[PDB]
Amino acid sequence: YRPGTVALREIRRYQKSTELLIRKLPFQRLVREIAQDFKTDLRFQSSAVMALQEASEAYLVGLFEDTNLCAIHAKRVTIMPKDIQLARRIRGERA
Amino acid sequence: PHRYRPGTVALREIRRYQKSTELLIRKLPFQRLVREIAQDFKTDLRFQSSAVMALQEASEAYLVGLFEDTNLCAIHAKRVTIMPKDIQLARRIRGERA
Amino acid sequence: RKESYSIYVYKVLKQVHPDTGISSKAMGIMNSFVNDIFERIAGEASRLAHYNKRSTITSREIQTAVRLLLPGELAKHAVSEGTKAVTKYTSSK
Amino acid sequence: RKESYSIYVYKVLKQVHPDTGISSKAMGIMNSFVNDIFERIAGEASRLAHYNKRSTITSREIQTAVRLLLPGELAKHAVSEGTKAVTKYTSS
Amino acid sequence: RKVLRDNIQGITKPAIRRLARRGGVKRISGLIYEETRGVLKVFLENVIRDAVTYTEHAKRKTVTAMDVVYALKRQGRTLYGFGG
Amino acid sequence: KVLRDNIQGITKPAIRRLARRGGVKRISGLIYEETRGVLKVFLENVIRDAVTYTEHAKRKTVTAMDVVYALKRQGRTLYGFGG
Amino acid sequence: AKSRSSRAGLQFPVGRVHRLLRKGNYAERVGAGAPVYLAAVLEYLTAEILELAGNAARDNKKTRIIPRHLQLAIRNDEELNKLLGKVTIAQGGVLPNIQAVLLP
Amino acid sequence: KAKSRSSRAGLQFPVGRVHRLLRKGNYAERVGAGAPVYLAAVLEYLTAEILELAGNAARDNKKTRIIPRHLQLAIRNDEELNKLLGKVTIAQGGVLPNIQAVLLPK
Ligand SMILES: [Cl-]
Ligand SMILES: [Cl-]
Ligand SMILES: [Cl-]
Ligand SMILES: [Cl-]
Ligand SMILES: [Cl-]
Ligand SMILES: [Cl-]
Ligand SMILES: [Cl-]
Ligand SMILES: [Cl-]
Ligand SMILES: [Cl-]
Ligand SMILES: [Cl-]
Ligand SMILES: [Cl-]
Ligand SMILES: [Cl-]
Ligand SMILES: [Cl-]
Ligand SMILES: [Cl-]
Ligand SMILES: [Cl-]
Ligand SMILES: [Cl-]
Ligand SMILES: [Cl-]
Ligand SMILES: [Cl-]
Ligand SMILES: [Cl-]
Ligand SMILES: [Cl-]
Ligand SMILES: [Cl-]
Ligand SMILES: [Cl-]
Ligand SMILES: [Cl-]
């Protein structure tokens, strides 16, 4: 189908859904690498990794929502790094 | 640089107001607003002067902060002019309307 | 570590929707909710008692904490349920 | 009727800038600042004690709270200064 | 007991303009003055409502600076300079 | 020394699906790397505080509750992991 | 009117709430009224979210509340949404909502 | 007169008062003796940091006396204090002079 039609269909599909969208094992290796920077020989309960993953995905989706409103504000349909940077500035995540 | 358009005047006004610390809303009108708003929640409420001053410092800091974000929103849209839709974007991302 | 209210949540579910069940993952959410709200109200009841130099948390601190923490319309309902319960407990009691 | 720390803020100002005074408004800001940071650190140290089922806030809870609350170098320097204070107090 | 009315209009165009200037704003649409009034009125109602809740809890009739500072904490804003 | 670059394990399609969940219709190619940067900063912040809780408790296993507490420190309350 | 909850007309546990208020470092003393009022409010708010989550279940022809329904309930209710504005429901998803400008 | 706890710890901030304030807040059933010492030490350090920066800002502007404005300039120009104090309003502090570059003549 047309790429705009495909996107919109993907939106409807991913909005009905609750599954985590990042691969479980890649996320887990990321968490382990970051933790090892702070303290070596740290282990994670598997439900600690799941908590991190649920929060990270929630965070990123919330951020994409704001990013999107920033794009639409500038009369674009396409999100760009400047949309992320604006949202994070107003959110107070960066100064 | 450029010479005295509204542009050049606005810029002097920005410089002037970012340099000072004084409150920018008239105090008696602010107090009357506070008292009016408090007339709903309760009859026969009084306000210490410093309470009204606390309310003013907080209100003005809140608006100035909100105007900062609003400006970034106008600039994002390639405008120098802030509009209500800029305020509303800012407030939404801040979570005040969400 | 955190308190479990599963039995109570379930009893409340049977009053409001008698023919609806709840998954164990949804029960986990509900537990997190009761704990969170408990901690918010208690922490505010505690700040209020300290602010007013009272060494006791009474139903008055709880009530004020509820009005502070809940949005206005929802606080009405919650204050009214709290007051009812205290009236019943205090009446025939 | 928040706690006043004026005397002590004066003593610190004289150590750091023997030169300079401080207005009473500015002093009010410093008092708010001390009370605010005290409440953040004690509130966190209280949560830590409770999480760990300890009846007791020690300098360990204070330290951890400082690490949680302060950013970057500020935390490192404040951790070092707390540790120095405790070492000197324990020695004397 | 005078019935106060319409005092939001005491938040004037020049006051609002001075606030936006401090906020670094170069140019201002004529529609932002009413928008700003609305935003200020909501913020103030929320704060004053929590301030009075503190005051009434303490069985006082006078709202203090500390009642305001506590109310502001409830909005997640920490105000310095009024603990005296 | 060793390449530690696990942020790159987070894949273009994962990022695209999160964006679609956030209602995004079209995504510039530059957003993928930008996103990985923001996610890394988020996770560093949370994990730094969670291991702080773990170490304070003299444990070597980070629990879900350590993460729940670390999230609260970022102003985020996560439900579902207290059991 | 045998247990403290029963006397209060409540399902939520008054004795247990009292105990938790005492162990929590909240005040020196906790009066008898406090855990009654706190339990009633906890019970009321629980019922609000179950009412609404139950309704979301029934709208999607389910008979079992899952996290999804809790998320829908909260996010569709202005009051619960404000109360829980910084809360993440694990496995909750988001509200189906596409900005009008993006539709053909 | 016995030697103050502050003296013994090498501090200006009051260790004794800090211990009483910790007990008066009901943060825990017990407060250990090192807690107020470490806490006073931190409060004193942070105070020293700000007053140093603020004293500087007062000089950078030909003044002999710290006003709220200098505290505000101190805090907002410092990456870490700015973060620490991100939700704080300093009464009578004003804002940092800063205009967006796009708004300025080229
Ligand atoms: Cl979260
Ligand atoms: Cl576009
Ligand atoms: Cl860009
Ligand atoms: Cl950014
Ligand atoms: Cl003034
Ligand atoms: Cl008047
Ligand atoms: Cl404020
Ligand atoms: Cl323009
Ligand atoms: Cl508009
Ligand atoms: Cl009571
Ligand atoms: Cl009833
Ligand atoms: Cl100790
Ligand atoms: Cl007008
Ligand atoms: Cl203008
Ligand atoms: Cl204060
Ligand atoms: Cl994939
Ligand atoms: Cl795309
Ligand atoms: Cl939990
Ligand atoms: Cl009971
Ligand atoms: Cl003392
Ligand atoms: Cl003592
Ligand atoms: Cl400076
Ligand atoms: Cl500039």
Side-chain angles (χ1 to χ4, degrees), chain A residues 1 3-38 40-42 44-95, chain B, chain C residues 1-91, chain D, chain E, chain F, chain G, chain H:
Chain A
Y1 234 98
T5 317
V6 171
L8 284 173
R9 177 142 34 79
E10 285 177 4
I11 297 168
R12 289 175 235 272
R13 176 196 182 181
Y14 290 113
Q15 299 183 342
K16 294 317 140 309
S17 191
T18 61
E19 30 145 5
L20 287 168
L21 303 169
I22 296 175
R23 298 173 299 151
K24 276 178 157 46
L25 266 297
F27 189 77
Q28 182 171 59
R29 291 189 301 271
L30 172 63
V31 161
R32 233 131 51 184
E33 168 191 299
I34 290 158
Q36 210 104 38
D37 258 322
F38 298 123
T40 31
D41 221 338
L42 275 159
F44 275 82
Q45 287 189 335
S46 68
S47 69
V49 182
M50 290 312 291
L52 284 162
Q53 195 167 170
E54 288 288 344
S56 297
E57 289 200 25
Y59 173 69
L60 290 175
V61 344
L63 181 60
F64 280 126
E65 297 177 343
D66 291 353
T67 295
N68 210 207
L69 302 169
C70 289
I72 286 166
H73 187 65
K75 297 164 201 160
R76 297 135 29 211
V77 131
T78 308
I79 61 162
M80 295 164 83
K82 63 171 144 167
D83 306 320
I84 302 177
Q85 285 156 205
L86 185 52
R88 300 186 74 235
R89 185 101 96 106
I90 296 172
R91 278 152 77 105
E93 290 176 33
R94 78 164 181 80
Chain B
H2 202 77
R3 279 311 99 203
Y4 310 18
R5 278 209 173 179
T8 301
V9 170
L11 283 176
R12 286 189 216 289
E13 274 164 36
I14 299 171
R15 285 193 287 259
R16 164 179 185 188
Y17 297 113
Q18 294 187 337
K19 184 180 142 34
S20 65
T21 54
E22 81 201 324
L23 286 169
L24 294 174
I25 299 172
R26 286 196 78 79
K27 288 185 184 65
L28 176 68
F30 188 82
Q31 179 162 296
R32 297 272 252 242
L33 181 53
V34 168
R35 291 202 198 267
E36 191 186 306
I37 287 167
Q39 264 179 0
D40 276 334
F41 311 134
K42 198 177 177 231
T43 303
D44 283 344
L45 224 30
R46 195 199 272 181
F47 281 86
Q48 289 190 334
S49 276
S50 54
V52 174
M53 300 293 299
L55 286 164
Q56 208 176 155
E57 296 281 349
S59 287
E60 294 200 16
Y62 167 79
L63 292 178
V64 163
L66 176 65
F67 279 128
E68 298 167 348
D69 296 346
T70 294
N71 209 214
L72 296 179
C73 288
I75 290 161
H76 192 70
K78 299 291 288 134
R79 293 180 273 103
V80 143
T81 303
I82 62 154
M83 293 169 84
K85 70 182 161 176
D86 300 324
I87 301 191
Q88 298 155 356
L89 184 58
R91 277 167 51 74
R92 220 230 260 231
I93 300 164
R94 281 164 159 238
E96 302 178 22
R97 85 202 309 145
Chain C
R1 186 49 203 149
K2 291 218 188 174
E3 188 68 19
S4 172
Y5 296 90
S6 301
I7 314 307
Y8 313 108
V9 172
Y10 184 75
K11 285 183 182 154
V12 171
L13 183 55
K14 271 201 88 166
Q15 277 153 186
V16 320
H17 282 109
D19 294 297
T20 302
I22 183 170
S23 67
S24 134
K25 262 173 192 169
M27 191 61 85
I29 284 146
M30 294 302 298
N31 284 319
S32 289
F33 175 67
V34 177
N35 286 295
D36 181 21
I37 303 309
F38 184 120
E39 296 147 10
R40 294 180 202 193
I41 293 168
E44 185 61 32
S46 175
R47 251 172 259 110
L48 281 161
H50 188 256
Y51 185 32
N52 293 94
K53 287 129 149 144
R54 307 315 217 96
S55 46
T56 321
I57 291 160
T58 69
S59 63
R60 179 193 186 78
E61 284 70 38
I62 304 296
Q63 177 166 103
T64 296
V66 175
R67 295 192 148 124
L68 286 168
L69 291 163
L70 273 56
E73 192 178 326
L74 204 59
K76 278 171 185 260
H77 299 290
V79 153
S80 145
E81 297 292 347
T83 301
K84 275 187 207 179
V86 161
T87 299
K88 291 186 202 144
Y89 174 87
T90 242
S91 255
Chain D
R1 295 169 315 104
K2 270 287 194 81
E3 187 75 6
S4 187
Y5 293 87
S6 304
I7 306 309
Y8 316 110
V9 339
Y10 264 113
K11 291 176 184 279
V12 179
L13 172 67
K14 302 193 63 194
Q15 292 182 333
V16 78
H17 283 124
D19 28 342
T20 122
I22 181 153
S23 65
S24 59
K25 247 69 159 318
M27 184 60 81
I29 287 143
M30 297 301 299
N31 281 328
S32 292
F33 169 70
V34 184
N35 285 126
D36 178 24
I37 304 312
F38 181 119
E39 292 157 13
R40 298 191 200 185
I41 296 169
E44 187 56 47
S46 176
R47 291 195 295 273
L48 281 155
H50 177 82
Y51 187 28
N52 289 102
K53 294 143 236 209
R54 313 301 289 208
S55 272
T56 311
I57 293 169
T58 77
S59 60
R60 192 200 171 69
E61 285 67 39
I62 302 302
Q63 184 161 97
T64 299
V66 171
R67 297 190 196 272
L68 294 171
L69 299 159
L70 270 53
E73 299 316 301
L74 222 46
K76 299 199 175 74
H77 287 232
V79 160
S80 160
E81 209 86 338
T83 308
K84 275 193 202 147
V86 178
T87 299
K88 171 169 176 77
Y89 179 83
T90 295
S91 88
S92 76
Chain E
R1 206 222 152 287
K2 181 211 202 166
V3 186
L4 300 162
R5 59 171 165 102
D6 299 308
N7 286 302
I8 192 54
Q9 291 305 313
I11 316 300
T12 59
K13 172 162 168 186
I16 287 159
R17 156 180 271 106
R18 292 184 287 275
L19 293 160
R21 294 298 193 244
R22 185 124 89 201
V25 169
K26 184 186 186 162
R27 189 159 187 281
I28 303 157
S29 157
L31 305 168
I32 82 105
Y33 307 111
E34 284 308 332
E35 199 66 4
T36 304
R37 287 180 188 113
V39 164
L40 174 63
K41 188 83 176 286
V42 178
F43 177 81
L44 269 182
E45 286 168 334
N46 287 347
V47 186
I48 290 158
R49 184 194 296 114
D50 295 336
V52 310
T53 296
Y54 283 113
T55 310
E56 301 180 334
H57 177 77
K59 278 162 159 167
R60 284 191 295 287
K61 300 147 78 88
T62 304
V63 183
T64 66
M66 202 58 30
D67 294 338
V68 180
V69 165
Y70 270 62
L72 287 163
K73 248 296 205 311
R74 223 70 269 322
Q75 312 265 310
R77 312 178 48 87
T78 288
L79 180 61
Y80 287 6
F82 288 88
Chain F
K1 300 155 207 204
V2 197
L3 180 66
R4 341 174 66 235
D5 201 23
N6 285 115
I7 196 59
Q8 301 305 155
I10 315 298
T11 246
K12 174 183 177 177
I15 297 169
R16 176 187 77 236
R17 285 162 186 148
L18 294 157
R20 291 297 176 244
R21 185 125 88 212
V24 172
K25 192 174 175 173
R26 191 163 189 284
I27 303 166
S28 151
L30 302 173
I31 97 86
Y32 302 102
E33 200 55 19
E34 198 75 12
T35 302
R36 288 185 187 99
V38 313
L39 174 63
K40 192 168 201 29
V41 167
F42 183 79
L43 273 169
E44 287 174 345
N45 289 345
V46 184
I47 291 164
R48 184 197 201 121
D49 289 344
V51 316
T52 296
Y53 285 111
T54 302
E55 280 172 347
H56 180 268
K58 289 154 162 185
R59 284 183 280 100
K60 275 170 26 171
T61 300
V62 183
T63 61
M65 203 50 52
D66 293 336
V67 170
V68 169
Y69 272 68
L71 287 159
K72 201 46 200 306
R73 288 255 44 259
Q74 331 299 139
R76 302 177 52 86
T77 295
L78 179 63
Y79 282 5
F81 292 91
Chain G
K2 187 51 233 172
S3 74
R4 293 207 253 5
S5 289
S6 201
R7 275 210 270 149
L10 302 177
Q11 230 62 27
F12 266 55
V14 171
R16 236 286 109 149
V17 170
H18 208 346
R19 175 53 217 240
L20 300 152
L21 287 164
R22 290 173 168 150
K23 56 186 300 315
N25 303 135
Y26 288 122
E28 275 223 357
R29 194 191 148 227
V30 179
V36 173
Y37 197 115
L38 178 51
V41 166
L42 294 182
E43 175 161 333
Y44 159 75
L45 288 170
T46 296
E48 277 276 1
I49 184 150
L50 297 179
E51 162 71 18
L52 297 175
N55 296 168
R58 309 215 213 237
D59 290 343
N60 298 307
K61 273 314 216 75
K62 313 290 174 161
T63 55
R64 182 168 224 220
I65 296 161
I66 68 171
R68 179 60 170 173
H69 304 322
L70 298 170
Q71 172 76 340
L72 295 175
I74 292 160
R75 275 42 256 204
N76 282 126
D77 184 54
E78 286 210 345
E79 303 286 288
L80 284 185
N81 192 231
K82 287 177 233 152
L83 183 62
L84 305 181
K86 317 270 210 24
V87 168
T88 300
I89 311 304
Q91 290 293 286
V94 306
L95 296 182
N97 185 52
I98 298 181
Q99 299 299 306
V101 72
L102 307 172
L103 308 179
Chain H
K1 325 88 185 77
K3 217 188 145 186
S4 73
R5 301 176 74 192
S6 289
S7 293
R8 293 161 53 197
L11 301 175
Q12 312 297 323
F13 271 52
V15 168
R17 185 58 182 163
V18 176
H19 206 167
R20 147 109 289 215
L21 294 171
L22 288 161
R23 289 167 159 151
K24 212 178 167 178
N26 214 6
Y27 287 113
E29 199 174 16
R30 296 176 44 182
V31 180
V37 171
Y38 202 109
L39 185 53
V42 172
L43 293 176
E44 175 168 336
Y45 166 76
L46 289 172
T47 301
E49 274 302 303
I50 299 185
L51 284 174
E52 168 125 274
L53 301 173
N56 285 178
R59 296 303 146 107
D60 295 331
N61 294 117
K62 307 139 187 190
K63 290 276 146 59
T64 68
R65 191 168 157 92
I66 298 154
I67 62 175
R69 175 61 164 182
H70 313 310
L71 295 166
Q72 169 75 336
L73 294 167
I75 290 153
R76 269 55 250 212
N77 282 125
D78 193 275
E79 187 207 44
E80 292 179 359
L81 288 172
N82 185 245
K83 190 174 179 42
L84 183 56
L85 300 182
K87 288 181 255 264
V88 159
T89 299
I90 302 305
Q92 285 295 301
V95 298
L96 278 197
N98 187 53
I99 304 177
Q100 294 309 112
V102 182
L103 308 184
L104 293 163
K106 91 206 163 57

